[PDB]
UniProtKB/Swiss-Prot annotation, chain A:
Gene designation per UniProt: INS
Whole-protein coverage range: 25 to 54 of 105
Top-rank lineage group of the source organism: Eukaryota
Protein name per Swiss-Prot or TrEMBL: Insulin B chain
Curated annotation (Swiss-Prot), chain B:
Disulfide links within the chain: 6-11
Section of the entire sequence shown: 85 to 105 of 105
Organism (species): Bos taurus (Bovine)
Coiled coil segments of this chain: none
Entry protein name: Insulin A chain
Length: 30, 21
């Protein structure tokens, strides 16, 4: 499908390909 | 969180959806 290999804020760009655009988030805490 | 999860081997969309708003 969209599936990839990379790191970081490319899984934002994967998130953008999956879920869509409009403000999209991140939920864990450390 | 999906910084690293994909930075290893290959990852699905349900992994990516998880985080999303």
């Amino acid at each position: 499908f969209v599936n990839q290999h990379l790191c970081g804020s490319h899984l934002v760009e994967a998130l953008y390909l999956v879920c869509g655009e409009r403000g999209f988030f991140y939920t864990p805490k450390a | 969180g999906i910084v690293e999860q994909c930075c290893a081997s290959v990852c699905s969309l349900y992994q990516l959806e998880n985080y999303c708003n």
